[PDB]
Design an enzyme around this catalytic site. Structure first.
Site, short mmCIF file in Angstrom:
data_model
loop_
_atom_site.label_atom_id
_atom_site.label_comp_id
_atom_site.label_asym_id
_atom_site.label_seq_id
_atom_site.Cartn_x
_atom_site.Cartn_y
_atom_site.Cartn_z
N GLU A 163 0.82 -1.21 0.00
CA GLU A 163 0.00 0.00 0.00
C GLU A 163 0.86 1.28 0.00
O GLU A 163 0.60 2.23 -0.75
CB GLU A 163 -0.93 0.01 1.21
CG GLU A 163 -2.07 -1.04 1.15
CD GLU A 163 -3.09 -0.76 0.04
OE1 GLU A 163 -3.00 0.31 -0.62
OE2 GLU A 163 -3.97 -1.62 -0.17
N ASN B 164 -7.50 8.76 -6.04
CA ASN B 164 -8.28 7.78 -6.78
C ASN B 164 -9.01 8.42 -7.95
O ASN B 164 -9.31 9.60 -7.89
CB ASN B 164 -9.27 7.09 -5.83
CG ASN B 164 -8.57 6.39 -4.68
OD1 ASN B 164 -8.98 6.50 -3.50
ND2 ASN B 164 -7.48 5.70 -5.00
N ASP C 76 -11.99 8.33 -8.76
CA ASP C 76 -13.28 8.85 -8.31
C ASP C 76 -13.18 10.16 -7.51
O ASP C 76 -14.20 10.72 -7.11
CB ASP C 76 -14.09 7.78 -7.55
CG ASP C 76 -13.58 7.49 -6.13
OD1 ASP C 76 -12.55 8.05 -5.71
OD2 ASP C 76 -14.22 6.70 -5.42
N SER D 60 -11.63 10.55 -4.56
CA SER D 60 -11.26 10.33 -3.15
C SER D 60 -9.73 10.22 -3.13
O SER D 60 -9.11 10.20 -4.18
CB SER D 60 -11.89 9.06 -2.58
OG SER D 60 -11.44 7.90 -3.29
N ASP E 290 -6.36 8.16 -0.88
CA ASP E 290 -5.94 7.17 0.12
C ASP E 290 -4.77 7.75 0.92
O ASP E 290 -3.85 8.35 0.35
CB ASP E 290 -5.46 5.89 -0.58
CG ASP E 290 -6.59 5.09 -1.21
OD1 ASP E 290 -7.79 5.42 -1.06
OD2 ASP E 290 -6.25 4.08 -1.86
N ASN F 262 -9.05 5.22 2.73
CA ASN F 262 -9.72 5.99 1.66
C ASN F 262 -10.67 7.05 2.27
O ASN F 262 -11.40 6.74 3.21
CB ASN F 262 -10.48 4.96 0.78
CG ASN F 262 -10.96 5.51 -0.57
OD1 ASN F 262 -11.22 4.74 -1.52
ND2 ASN F 262 -11.11 6.80 -0.66
#
Ligand SMILES: [Cl-]
Ligand SMILES: [Cl-]
Ligand SMILES: [Cl-]
Ligand SMILES: [Cl-]
Ligand SMILES: [Cl-]
Ligand SMILES: [Cl-]
Ligand SMILES: [Cl-]
Ligand SMILES: [Cl-]
Ligand code: NA
Length: 129
Positions: free
Chosen positions: A35, A46, A48, A50, A52, A59
């Site tokens: 990660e 992201n 979309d 958002s 992380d 998220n």
């Protein structure tokens, strides 16, 4: 902060992540490796919109507030910035909520694709724990 492998293993264990929801410590170390490469300051946007955050790439769509993710929730009741601290407490506490949400560690797509089913014990091999 960029953790060493055994250093992070030790911190996660100290914060009660080891065998949390039945997930051995190597699962958590493996997830963090892929990660964030063990970097607490890691952030990734992201598609979309958002973002992380942190060692476990939590998220903003569901778990923390960053003030720029329309329609999202803040189920960990924390600013996403708290997830970038050198102290992993906020990330661990929030990860416990995520992993209890119903789908276990599958919430972490990198865990599903790179850690699940593998020899995750290798991640804690040789660590003084
Ligand atoms: Cl490593
Ligand atoms: Cl393990
Ligand atoms: Cl927001
Ligand atoms: Cl922005
Ligand atoms: Cl919320
Ligand atoms: Cl906030
Ligand atoms: Cl810590
Ligand atoms: Cl599970
Ligand atoms: Na949010």
């Amino acid at each position: 902060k960029v953790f060493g492998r055994c250093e992070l293993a030790a911190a996660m264990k100290r914060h009660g992540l080891d065998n949390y929801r039945g997930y051995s410590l190597g699962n958590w170390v493996c997830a963090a490796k892929f990660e964030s490469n063990f970097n607490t300051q890691a952030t990734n946007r992201n598609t979309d919109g958002s973002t992380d955050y942190g060692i476990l790439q939590i998220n903003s769509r569901w778990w923390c507030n960053d003030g720029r993710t329309p329609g999202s929730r803040n189920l960990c009741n924390i600013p996403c910035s708290a997830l970038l601290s050198s102290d992993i407490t906020a990330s661990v506490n929030c990860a416990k909520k995520i992993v209890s949400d119903g789908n276990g560690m599958n919430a972490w797509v990198a865990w599903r694709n790179r850690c699940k089913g593998t020899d995750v014990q290798a991640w804690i091999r040789g660590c003084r724990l």
